[PDB]
Amino acid sequence: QFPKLREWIGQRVIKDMAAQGYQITNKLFESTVGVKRTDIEDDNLGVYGPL
Amino acid sequence: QFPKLREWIGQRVIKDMAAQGYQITNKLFESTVGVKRTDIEDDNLGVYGPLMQEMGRAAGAHPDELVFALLKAGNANLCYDGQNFFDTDHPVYPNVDGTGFAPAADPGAAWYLLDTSRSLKPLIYQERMKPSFTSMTKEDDEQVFMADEYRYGVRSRCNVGFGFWQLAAMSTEELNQVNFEKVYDAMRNQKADGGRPLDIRPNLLVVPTTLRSKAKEVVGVQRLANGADNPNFELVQVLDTAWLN
Amino acid sequence: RPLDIRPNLLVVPTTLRSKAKEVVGVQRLANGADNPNFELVQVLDTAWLN
Amino acid sequence: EVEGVFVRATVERRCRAGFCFDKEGQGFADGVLSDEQLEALESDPLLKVERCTFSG
Amino acid sequence: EVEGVFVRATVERRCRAGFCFDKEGQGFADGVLSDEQLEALESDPLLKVERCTFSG
């Protein structure tokens, strides 16, 4: 941000702008569960398959 | 102001009137940033260029900073009376009056506003672009951007301003009833030359962010802090700020 | 220069939901005294932490 | 190398021992080290600057 | 505080004995004493002049 107005005191207190970079990366967030084809296709209640 | 209209018996006294001329000088303020000429063009996200124009925002914010710095100095600085703005020994003609975290009770509807500012010159923009200064030919490729200011605050009326509070809200008889209502009574009891009232109508309360909630409790809720009462509900409207303290 | 912050979100765990609602949502805090923060910050509860 | 010394005729901010005097011409402009403290070092080039590389 | 200083090795007209020669003396923009002599001594600079805060 632009520096605060301080005073005259004859001269100018030259200032420098501030760079505030903030690096941040990305990650991977997989998850899963193993099942079997026969189990899904042979169960009668059918609650095994809403995966 | 005129002397009070007295009784008439045998002859008329040709009274006189005083004058309290107040003197205050001007101060100069500036803020500048040095930047490389090549860098402003050497950008693709449109940054490091608006920063030079940000001096306009800085100048716009400057008057608030100046006025509130003078408000802070109020206790230290002197008013026209020759005493401190918030002093307990303000000299009135026959006797001496007294008006002394960071409080202030002010009128707003009066013909005068306390801590009056002075926008003597506008927020002129000062710039160092190219073949206008030597910083860019017989020097590096440097450019400075500046905002000149030539303003200053004023201690307007020290006989209508009150400060130095233990600002509190509790018991409706010892903390608020004896401090905030004390200030209310003192401000409304101010007497001018001749013993007449100043018609002081405290309606502005200025406090820093730390006292915002407690000021709102003093003005805004029927009960103060214990369920007793709140005599000062909707009597002075508080505006929050942070420039002071 | 002040940042000019305007805190308007209060996120707390479930165990603090009732206390946060008391802080913002009722005129009295816990003893019939007062609640300076009533209708100040709208509290949202969360159970993904702690 | 030292791309710019930023020293000639200018004096910058130097905060040492709790008092920030202005002397010794410690101006610099690079991203080598102490970049954060570069702001403090260059916080007061009050006087006119005139760059000249030392080719360090 | 005193506003007024000349610290650029700048030249000013200071008169020692029958002549006025380069030298840096008072070099201030405020005066309370030796005004008549200061005028001769405080002739504005010949070369680059820059001011500071002595605060003496």
Author numbering:
A (entry chain F): 52 to 102
B (entry chain A): 52 to 151, 160 to 304
C (entry chain F): 255 to 304
D (entry chain L), E (entry chain K): 53 to 108
The authors write:
Bacteriophage Casadabanvirus JBD30, from the order Caudoviricetes, is a temperate phage that infects the bacterium Pseudomonas aeruginosa.
Approximately one-half of phage JBD30 virions in our sample had capsids decorated with trimers of minor capsid proteins (gp39). The fold of minor capsid protein of JBD30 consists of a three-stranded antiparallel β-sheet, short β-hairpin stabilized by a disulphide bond between Cys67 and Cys72, and an α-helix. Cryo-EM density of the N-terminal region of the minor capsid protein, residues 1–52, was not resolved enough to enable determination of its structure. The interactions of the minor capsid proteins with major capsid proteins are mainly electrostatic. Lys197 from α5 helix of the peripheral domain of the major capsid protein forms a salt bridge with the minor capsid protein residue Glu198. The major capsid protein residues Glu198, Ser194 and Thr193 interact with the minor capsid protein residue Lys100. Despite low sequence identity (13.1%), the topology of the JBD30 minor capsid protein resembles the β-tadpole fold of the T4 auxiliary protein Soc.
